[PDB]
Amino acid sequence: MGKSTLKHTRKIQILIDLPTKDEKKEVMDMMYQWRDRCFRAANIIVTHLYVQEMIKDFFYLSEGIKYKLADEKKDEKGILQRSRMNTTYRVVSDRFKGEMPTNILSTLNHGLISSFNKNRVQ
DNA sequence: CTAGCGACTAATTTTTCGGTTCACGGTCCCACAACTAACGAC
Numbered sequence: 798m799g800k801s802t803l804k805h806t807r808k809i810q811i812l813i814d815l816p817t818k819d820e821k822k823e824v825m826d827m828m829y830q831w832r833d834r835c836f837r838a839a840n841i842i843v844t845h846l847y848v849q850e851m852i853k854d855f856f857y858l859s860e861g862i863k864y865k866l867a868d869e870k871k872d873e874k875g876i877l878q879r880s881r882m883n884t885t886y887r888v889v890s891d892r893f894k895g896e897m898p899t900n901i902l903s904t905l906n907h908g909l910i911s912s913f914n915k916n917r918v919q
Numbered sequence: 920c921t922a923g924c925g926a927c928t929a930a931t932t933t934t935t936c937g938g939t940t941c942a943c944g945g946t947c948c949c950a951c952a953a954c955t956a957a958c959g960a961c
Contacts, residue, residue, distance in 0.1 A: 883925075886923075898921075898922090903923090
């Protein structure tokens with residue numbers, strides 16, 4: 798069956814449901830920290846998904862090697878030790894865990910790794 | 920419930936027309952002004 802839906806987005810205002818000011822402020826500061834960690838994360842993922850392609854290019858300029866993004870346990874020419882999205886998610890979680898939730902990391906990882914493969918041509 | 924994963928503008932000059940000056944052999948009709956001949960008063 799075809800897609801019988803069209804994606805849509807709505808803006809819902811939310812207040813923090815706490816009695817006192819200090820708890821609300823603690824939650825709001827935690828969420829601002831979440832913002833900062835998310836942006837630093839996005840930077841880390843994009844750098845870490847740039848570098849390896851240029852390592853591929855380096856090897857190809859060395860001996861025309863056909864190195865490709867795949868787990869070496871599943872590919873002879875693979876260099877990665879796991880799935881690429883897992884590599885970015887790991888290299889961001891190992892540093893930013895315990896401060897902001899990991900679902901933000903997973904969503905950001907998917908959102909950037911999906912687009913970067915399309916941007917490979919450019 | 921969370922974490923790993925798939926060149927334009929201003930200044931100066933020059934020129935045609937107008938102004939000024941000199942100044943010897945039909946008709947018919949209705950009014951209006953004369954106007955004058957006769958008539959009456961001193």
